[model samples]
Target: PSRTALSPGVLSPTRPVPNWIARPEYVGKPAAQEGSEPWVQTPEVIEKMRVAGRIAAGALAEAGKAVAPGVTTDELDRIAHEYLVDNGAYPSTLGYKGFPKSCCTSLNEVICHGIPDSTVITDGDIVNIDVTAYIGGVHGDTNATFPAGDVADEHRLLVDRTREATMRAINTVKPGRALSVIGRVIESYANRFGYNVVRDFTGHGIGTTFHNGLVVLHYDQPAVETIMQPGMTFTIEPMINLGALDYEIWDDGWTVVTKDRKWTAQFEHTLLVTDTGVEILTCL
Candidate 1:
């Protein structure tokens, strides 16, 4: 049987955040405020970011638990949205840069930033849920790909490799390590399985702001030879595809999918470079 590529569906109205929730400065703006935060944060800020990172991790975990046959993408979004709100945090994705949904629900061929809508997840599908939380004047971001019901062997292999690649990169994080090493490790490992790391969307530094100055590439780029330092927080989300690296964006301007229509998987986690090593801030 041939698999069908996913398409856009009707989107629901934008969900509302409670008045007490601490929202990011870009809630109503068309773009994120200028990325001016320092690459290395203070210990106090790092502590606050831990709270934000844990909250985001919880929301993402709840959404992953809900990824199964017959579940609508919007339902998963609401699950994560409510989890953040319940903890007195804001769903960081909502209203930022005109994004309507509280979180993203990317499916099958979708690469990243898939807007949550009425699309129902079917069996044997791989779904990636991205989530961020704003709390205590800081933000934390993380995501993971899950198998809806029963996924096929090849698709699940891609999902597992994507996660492993991110962890492998994280394991090498230290004060003196070069930033390029992160991408080099991920790309080399994915190549063994003939998988392609997504180039269009590279992980970025995240902290007080959603995206800061430090751009983290998932492939070796020797030019970005910045050395890691303690208290520097960023994401190591790598999107690995089962086919070619080429991808196309939808008319809505967010959802990205492989041009070959092959399945893709992604896993993300906010990491903090410590004086000795790295910490997985979003760890469950």
Candidate 2:
């Protein structure tokens, strides 16, 4: 049987970040120049990152609280945007590579980059709200899957296991550890529950720049030899699928759903390798 192409729904109007919020260098300007710079952040930059991370975490929390049956995904986007703007931070996902929404709303079979729209969420649905914020010329990112009213037992297990997989991967972070261990740990945990990790998207080095050279995979790849070092920062998000690992993109060119239309869930956290261990910058 062939998979059905799902409607991505209508695009929401671009929500403007308040002029008072400090914009990134790339905002409405030429793409910021990138070169070999110290990916490891300095002490001062780390402080700014902490602030940005907390704000991004707060925005995601606000959106998560607003998730429920009958609430449009756009409403969650508005909540996230308002929270970031009110705190004097820019929604990093807005206009990012031409993405329209302030926050990504990935529901059920939708894997990631699910654009917010007029589609009203219904009972038994699981939605992943991904949020990122730019403040003081730095970026912070995080996300989590939430259950709509009375989600099915299997769907609930998928959401819970996805979150656990992310946490388990994060627990392995420390100075001198190979970056590949993150994916190995995540894949191992997901496999225990018979889930598959989405390999198309990866966690990235995020600091002053939204993404840098470091790529954090959520599936086991023994060849990835990047070493985790103190002061290096990046995200660790695992997108776990309950069925086939394959995915397809929508005509809008943003929404990605599972090829088999089975449900998917994900959880993310931005982390900083500390002198002794790692810090979850986006932690509440």
Candidate 3:
């Protein structure tokens, strides 16, 4: 999907939207209150982040390896959960914000935040495994989209473009750079490939908190101007749609589906801002 006109009511860059999602009414959990003690990274926190990142990446890789026709999403969730626990990490999504699943397995038109359940991985379907792990004293988050079995040519292209868009977004991360730079880079790449970026959900700060106050919007809107400062950790996940970018939340209060129900793809990685460059903490 190509870039469309900016949506109305989006906070403008001139207005400078505050990272206000941390407000008590909006965020049920306080930022920097869990997993890591004292919140900020010490040597121990960095090591814990490494451990958590390893666990998260391992779980995602394992789940991806397990993907095949006839395998249920619930089974995949179990695979990820057991792996995390066995490795001494916790499934960060389970019970977080009342989420029931250990990992999110979004398929087809479903975008981000899909809960894992009894749905089977059909041959033609494409799925995204969203994983987060809390280990030692920190958290790790990442996700990837994969072909279930033998996918069609169009879906293969979608997966490739979505994955490329995610890397493009991550490549733009640098200290003192505006976070919106990453958004612009991702949107430009998606438009070049005739794909749309999902604006409803954005990457966020992660560490001790599941989702910290920061919001990393993926559209090239002026509202996203936060500078990437050293020690700031966040995610740059991009959700690319093969059709219209508009989306609607389901009645279940969790599943987010595209308005046109066209196939969607997403990829993510948690990053830590450094003085010289960004550290992709979730990488294997």
Best-matching candidate per lDDT? 1
The Cα local distance difference test for each model comes to 0.90, 0.88, 0.76
Candidate 2 Cα errors over 4 Å, as ranges: 1-6, 29-37
lDDT of 3 by residue, 113-161 (tens): 8777767677778889989887665679989998887888888899998
Q: Across residues 45-66, which tens digit of lDDT does each residue of candidate 2 receive? A: 8899999999999999999999
In terms of TM-score, which candidate is stronger, 2 or 3? 2
TM-score sort, best first: 1, 2, 3
Candidate maximizing TM-score: 1
Every model's TM-score = 0.98, 0.94, 0.84
How big is the positional error of residue 169 in model 1, measured in Å on the Cα after superposition?
0.8
Model 1 lDDT per residue over 1-284, tens place: 32598889999877778898867889888888847878998999999999989999999999999898899999999899899999999988898888889899999999999999989999889999999999998889999999987788898789888889988999999998998999999999999999988887989898888899789999878888699998899999999999998999999988999999999998999999998999999977
**lDDT score of residue 36 within candidate 2:** 49
- lDDT (Cα, 0-100) at 2 in candidate 3: 21
- lDDT comparing candidate 3 with the true structure: 0.76
